[PDB]
Amino acid sequence: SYIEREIKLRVISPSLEEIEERIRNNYTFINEEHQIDIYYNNPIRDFRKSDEALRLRNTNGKVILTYKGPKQSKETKTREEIEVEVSDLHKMDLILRKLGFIRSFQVEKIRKNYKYADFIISLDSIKELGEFIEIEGINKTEKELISFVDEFVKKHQIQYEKTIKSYLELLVEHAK
């Protein structure tokens, strides 16, 4: 069991490309991920009602199966997270479909990951949604994370809007 604690910002201004130039100076680039996500649902235990999730992710060809627990926070996306890498995405999907899970929706993004003193800054560009930033802390308190995010946006003059809604949620509303 690992506890995911992150803050998600919708970027109002400037673009991620401009933000990338402002942080390039003192933020060490890690890698870029092309992530295709398939979310599943248990027909008897709707994860939207229990606030859970089961996700099969393809990130640069690496296949990862992820369960996420209920949100334990209102100011950050605090959740239980358990992940394993699997050998074959198709056969993992088949097993899940054979076990009775149904594919709910798909999410796709390009994520650029930067690091800074136990903080993981992710520049997210979502297909048909827009540009977001996620900051995740390694063994950091909710106050430490909230405080750093405030410093990050001020230092780089970012106009933003916080949200604990997930990309999958944002994608649903945007459809209507």
Ligand X SMILES: Nc1ncnc2c1ncn2[C@@H]1O[C@H](COP(=O)(O)OP(=O)(O)OP(=O)(O)O)[C@@H](O)[C@H]1O
Q: Residues interacting with ligand X, by CB under 6 A?
A: 39, 41, 47-48, 51, 53, 68, 77, 104, 134, 166-169
Only segment of 13-21, 39-47, 109-117, 163-171 that touches a copy of itself (CB under 8 A): 39-47
Q: Toward ligand X, which CB reaches closer, 20 or 41?
A: 41
Known active-site residue 160 = no
Q: Which is nearer to a copy of itself, 44 or 175 (CB)?
A: 44
Structure tokens at 115: 């690091």
Cβ(35)–Cβ(123) below 8 Å:
no
SS3 state at 15: coil
Tokens 């599943």 -> residue: 40
Task: Measure the CA–CA gap between 143 and 94, rounded to whole angstroms.
Answer: 42
End-to-end CA distance of the chain: 36
Interface contacts to Ca ion, rule CB under 5 A:
6, 134, 136
Q: How many CA atoms lie within 13 A of 146 on its CB side?
A: 11
Among 12, 30, 94, 138, binds a copy of itself (CB under 8 A): 94
> What are the distances in angstroms from CA 128 to CA 6, 110, 175?
22, 12, 9
**Residue 27 counted as an annotated binding residue:** no
Contact 81, 2 (CB under 8 A): yes
Shortest Cβ 14–ligand X spacing (Å): 21
Nearest to a copy of itself of 97, 162 (CB atom)? 97
Of 39, 40, 114, 116, the catalytic one is 39
3 state DSSP class of 139: coil
Binding-site entries for Mg(2+): 6, 134
Catalytic residues: 39
What residue ranges bind a copy of itself (CB under 8 A)?
1, 42, 44-45, 54, 65, 67, 69, 82-88, 91-92, 94-95, 98-100
